[PDB]
From a paper:
The cellular role of DNPH1 is to remove hydroxymethyl deoxyuridine monophosphate (hmdUMP) from the nucleotide pool. Hydrolysis generates deoxyribose monophosphate (dRP) and hydroxymethyl uracil (hmU) products. Glycosidic bond cleavage is driven by a conserved catalytic triad and proceeds via a two-step mechanism involving formation and subsequent disruption of a covalent glycosyl-enzyme intermediate. Each DNPH1 monomer adopts a Rossmann-like fold consisting of five core β-strands surrounded by five major α-helices.
To visualise the trapping of the glycosyl-enzyme intermediate, we employed a crystallisation construct harbouring a single E55Q point mutation. Purified DNPH1E55Q protein was co-crystallised with hmdUMP and the structure solved in space group P212121 at 1.65 Å resolution using the DNPH1E104Q structure for molecular replacement. In the crystal structure a biologically active homodimer comprises the asymmetric unit, and both active sites contain a trapped glycosyl-enzyme intermediate with deoxyribose monophosphate (dRP) covalently fused to E104. However, in both chains, the dRP:E104 moiety adopts two distinct, alternative conformations, one of which permits an additional interaction between the constituent sugar and surrounding sidechains. The base of the substrate has been cleaved and is no longer visible, but has been largely replaced by a well-defined water network. This network is stabilised in part by E55Q, which is now presented into the active site through reorganisation of the helical element harbouring the LTEHV motif. Consequently, H56 tucks away below the anomeric carbon. Remarkably, E55Q appears to be ideally positioned although, due to the mutation, chemically unable to activate one of the bound waters for nucleophilic attack at the anomeric carbon, in agreement with activity assays. Crucially, the conserved catalytic aspartate (D80) is too far away to perform this activation, and the active site arrangement indicates that this is also the case in the wild-type enzyme. In this dominant arrangement, H56 electrostatically drives the dRP 3′ hydroxyl group to form a hydrogen bond with the remaining sidechain carbonyl oxygen of E104.
Author numbering:
A (entry chain A): 18 to 60, 72 to 160
B (entry chain B): 19 to 58, 69 to 159
């Protein structure tokens, strides 16, 4: 509790297409606090559910990369909204996808923000959000 | 008309299973009023979010087909759990996918149930759930 707790979410069983980007995000988040996340660099379901729920409640900020569709990321964002968490979502329009209306439409520009970004930009945008 | 039955399934995550969603929605109509975005373009997404949240809050039972990964379906299920809704999830293992741990691990066998099924079983299973 001596540093901010930053909870990172991104697709796993939805697909690990963006795993490298997730590691880039996590690595940068470590500059701004303790990172709580299921994601581990390449280098039971009830327990997985309960641990991520535990991390989520501990979180001061929830950071989600929402480009790859994922039930778990969506579920974690829904639980996070119900917990009144500050939320930042990061989405890549160049993927060719249209972001879920439930995520884009949940944005209010303050406590729930959805930022579009392109390859090469995410570290700069994280610096902006966390006030480097 | 009650019960109100809220159906969720992938849309912008992919419409791979849209025909199965229609089969599910058609069978749900036998047991209650069906509230769903599904019917057989961003820029106004706030209105979509608010409308599905409205339907979810009115729902007596939430039915989700969770085979195709979807942020919206997952988000709706997360909000549904926070609302302490009765939830039924339906998953097809023959899809070759491993269902999200956040959905499978949310199950408690009563208020939150996850049923595996195969093509051709979904109507019988819905009949069974809704008595
Ligand atoms: C909670 C942590 C992680 O971000 C998310 C992964 O969900 P999947 O359904 O496995 O993609 O769950
Ligand atoms: C709310 C209703 C529907 O089941 C779900 C679809 O989400 P997508 O992110 O568009 O797949 O959203």
């Amino acid at each position: 509790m001596g540093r901010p707790a930053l909870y990172f979410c991104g697709s796993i069983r939805g697909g690990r297409e963006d795993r490298t980007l997730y590691e880039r995000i996590v690595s940068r988040l470590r500059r701004f606090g303790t990172v709580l996340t299921q994601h581990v660099a390449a280098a039971g379901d009830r327990l997985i559910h309960e641990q991520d729920l535990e991390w989520l409640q501990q979180a001061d900020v929830v950071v989600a990369e929402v480009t790859q569709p994922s039930l778990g990321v969506g579920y974690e964002l829904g639980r996070a909204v119900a917990f009144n968490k500050r939320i930042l979502c990061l989405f890549r329009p160049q993927s060719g996808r249209v972001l879920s209306a439930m995520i884009r439409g949940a944005a209010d520009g303050s406590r729930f923000q959805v930022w579009d970004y392109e390859e090469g930009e995410v570290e700069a945008l994280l610096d902006r959000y966390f006030e480097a």
